[PDB]
Amino acid sequence: KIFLENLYHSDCYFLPIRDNQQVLVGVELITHFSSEDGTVRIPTSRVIAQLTEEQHWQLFSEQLELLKSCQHFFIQHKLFAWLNLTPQVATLLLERDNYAGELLKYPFIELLINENYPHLNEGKDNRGLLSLSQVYPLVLGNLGAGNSTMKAVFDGLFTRVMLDKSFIQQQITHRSFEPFIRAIQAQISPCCNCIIAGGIDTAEILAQITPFDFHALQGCLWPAVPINQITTLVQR
């Protein structure tokens, strides 16, 4: 019941993911970590770098427990939740005879990775990712970040893919490149139905992105909310 809270305090937020009509369809679970005594906020990358494999599992478990605690809300409003997947947790899910089960029972919870995931360029040849994708919803959170190829996408590993804010904003800022978004979207859609656009941070960006008809959108227009205020995101 303590998980990682004896080492770092997790102050958790939900990033709203809304469809092209702004209806809430899911949330991404994020954490602002503080030191144990609360004196300083610690960058997530620095927290994650330190963790042993068991600590990686504890942090994952703490987040799972948080999401499980919201299960009635997620099911009732038909939403999904993104939970960060690290390779350390991947190994434990795949190689223990009793870790994979709890996650499985909550299918609204989806495993989120980024283009920096180890050996992502192997696509379906990444044994761990292939295996997890066989039973869990897998999401690539930052397609277009320029840190991997799309092999894993065309290999069919993902349930959803989100185009990174840097990619979306680059093509919208340099307006003549907007067709590049359309071409990328068209090519990916058969291999992954659900394409999401990040970086929707201004009214102008939303106006430009709406005609693309992405399944969902994420960005500063819909600020993070503390996890206990998730009810503020849906109809009263």
Residue numbers in the entry: 2 to 237
Quote the authors verbatim.
The products of flhDC operon, FlhD and FlhC, form a heterohexamer (D4C2) to bind to the upstream of class II promoters and promote class II genes transcription. Recently, two other proteins, FliT and YdiV, are recognized as negative regulators that prevent FlhD4C2 from binding to its target DNA by direct protein–protein interactions. Wada et al. demonstrated that Salmonella YdiV functions as a novel anti-FlhD4C2 factor, which regulates bacterium motility and is responsible for nutritional control of the flagellum regulation in Salmonella. Our structure analyses combined with biochemistry studies and reconstruction of YdiV4–FlhD4C2 structure via negative staining electron microscopy provide a clear regulatory mechanism that stoichiometric binding of YdiV to FlhD in the FlhD4C2 complex results in the opening of the ring-like structure of FlhD4C2 with consequent loss of DNA binding.
The final model of YdiV contains two protein molecules (Mol A and Mol B) per asymmetric unit. The YdiV monomer consists of 10 α-helices, 8 β-strands and 2 short 310 helices, which exhibits a modified TIM-like barrel fold. Although YdiV shares low-sequence identities with other EAL domain proteins (below 20% for the full length), the topology of the structures is the same. Particularly, the α8-helix of YdiV, which is essential for dimerization in other EAL structures, undergoes dramatic transformation. Electron density map clearly shows the existence of a phosphate and a glycerol molecule in this groove. The interaction style of YdiV’s Mol A and Mol B is completely different from other dimerized EAL structures, such as Blrp1, YkuI, TBD1265, LapD and FimX. The Mol A and Mol B’s α8-helices, whose corresponding helices mediates the dimerization in Blrp1, YkuI, LapD and TBD1265 structures, are far away from each other. The interaction interface between the two monomers is also smaller than that of the standard EAL protein dimers.
